From a paper:
However, the overall structure showed the same conformation as lpWalK co-crystallized with AMPPCP. Indeed, we also observed the same conformation for lpWalK that was crystallized in the presence of ADP. Interestingly, the interaction between Lys476 and Ala406 in lpWalK is not found in smVicK as Lys476 is substituted by Gln301. Together, our data indicate that WalK adopts a closed structure in the presence of ATP analogues or ADP, which is characterized by the asymmetric positioning of the two CA domains; only one monomer of the dimer switches to a closed conformation while the other one remains open. The adenine plane of ADP is sandwiched by Tyr518 from the N box on one side and by Ile547 from the G1 box and Phe603 from β7 on the other, and is further fixed by a hydrogen bond between Asp542 and the amine at adenine C6. The α-phosphate (αP) forms hydrogen bonds to the amine of Asn514 and the main chain of residues 574–577 from the G2 box. The β-phosphate (βP) forms hydrogen bonds to Gly572 and Thr573 from the G2 box. ATP/ADP fits into the active site of the CA domain through extensive interactions involving the N box and the G1 and G2 loops. We have found that ATP/ADP interacts with His391 in the DHp domain through hydrogen bonds in the closed lpWalK. AMP has extremely weak binding abilities. In agreement with these results, a recent report has indicated that ADP rather than AMP is an efficient VicK kinase inhibitor.
A typical TCS is composed of a sensor histidine kinase (SK) and a cognate response regulator (RR), which are encoded by genes that are often clustered in the genome. Modulated by stimulating signals, an SK first performs an autokinase activity and phosphorylates a conserved histidine in its DHp domain. Here, we sought to determine the crystal structures of a WalK homologue, lpWalK from Lactobacillus plantarum, which shares 60% sequence identity in the DHp and CA domains to our previous solved smVicK structure, in different conformations in the presence of ATP analogues or ADP. The catalytic region of lpWalK contains one DHp domain (amino acids 370–450) and one CA domain (amino acids 450–624).
Residue numbers in the entry:
A (entry chain B): 384 to 441, 451 to 477, 482 to 564, 570 to 610
B (entry chain A): 372 to 477, 479 to 564, 570 to 610
Write the structure that this text describes.
């Protein structure tokens, strides 16, 4: 059913949560410098998941947001996923400008979640996931590069098809189909370049003003 | 008519239940977190206790989405199976061993003994070892959870010309005869944290996928017996 979809999308926020709670429980609660901030995040994520379940049991909600530190926030949650508990670095290279863009926040945060999952999951044996936020031509470009298993150039098309998975562990293959679905739904475009064994780079373009 | 309709109706109530059964731990979660954010975290006497409850609830929903995902995969037919000839006897024995050894490492809340009564023949049978061992696991888990203290889980591996039978017997409080049909339905729980109401549902699904058939006999106040039947030669 469409149940399979909520099943899939709750995965990464459940992870974010379990990861943060485990951090607080492992002592961070005693630390006044951080424990509140973590609590705000666990709160925000729980509320996110509730919204998610409600919209999918019973539309887009476009609002203007500051893409820069939304992307920073998502990346923060993953930084905390990769801590606690191969080594991965999230190398961030954003423009210093604050690019504002019309999007659905929960849907788009789901997109970034899937693509960081991909960049990380198909990167065993370590890696450096490199995240770039820039703009040209009234478009806002996000790129995510990993030193993963790459993609055979034959399949570079099919990675956005439903259930389509490469040969080589895990998943139903609806991550990138949902991602493409959402990105096109927001008036933007998504694509991938990749070199088998080298790594990969995922791109999203969104209209700017 | 009622053909297509039973299908669509079952589907829509399953969606309604997934909505609720997912949403409810999220709600509980929200309440504890919100409590912690509103000061409880500064309090050493309560903050750990709350953090454990929130940890556990989160783990619960994770297991649930794993099971709702394997269930989607099985309805879809996406669920690939690998039938291979394996030794049912020592597979069932290895399962029982893992359970014996969890309780052999102590101190335990409740105490149970696993009584094994197997046929002496070495039954070789084509099955997917991993999915079927998951089945045996849910049913043993179940057998254990609804057991009294000192209870005896009675596990039988036997055979008939036509069949290979596994039974898992518990001395729990049994199942109302109204509900004997419903015990394998999704999210169906008798009363009841501790787990998702998808254990037995997955079990029945997997067993039918492996070509066998699964059912329950039970007497209120006495206990229960779960049966798995597999085709033999
Ligand atoms: N960095 C990456 N490197 C190599 N392959 C990738 C990468 N990201 C996505 N893919 C490919 O996309 C396929 C399916 O993607 P996805 O929808 O995310 O599946 P899943 O259900 O596991 O989440 C995968 O088989 C994978 O090979």
């Amino acid at each position: 059913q469409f149940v399979s979809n909520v099943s899939h999308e709750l995965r990464t926020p459940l992870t974010s949560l379990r990861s943060y709670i485990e951090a607080l429980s492992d002592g961070a609660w005693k630390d006044p410098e951080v424990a509140p901030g973590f609590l705000k995040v666990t709160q925000e994520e729980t509320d996110r998941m509730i919204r998610m379940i409600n919209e999918l049991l019973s539309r887009v909600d476009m609002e203007l947001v500051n893409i820069n530190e939304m992307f920073n926030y998502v990346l923060d949650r993953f930084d905390m996923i990769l801590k606690k508990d191969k080594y991965y670095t999230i190398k961030r290279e954003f423009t210093k400008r604050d690019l504002w863009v019309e999007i659905d926040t929960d849907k788009f945060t789901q997109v970034l979640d899937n693509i960081m999952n991909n960049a990380i999951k198909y990167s065993p044996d370590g890696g450096v996931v490199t995240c770039r936020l820039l703009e040209t031509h009234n478009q806002v470009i996000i790129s995510i590069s990993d030193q993963g298993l790459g993609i055979p150039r034959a399949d570079l098309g099919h990675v956005f098809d439903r259930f389509f998975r490469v040969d080589k562990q895990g998943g139903t293959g609806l991550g990138l189909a949902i991602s493409k679905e959402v990105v096109q739904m927001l008036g933007g475009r998504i694509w991938v370049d990749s070199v088998e064994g080298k790594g990969s780079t995922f791109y999203i373009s969104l209209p700017y003003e």
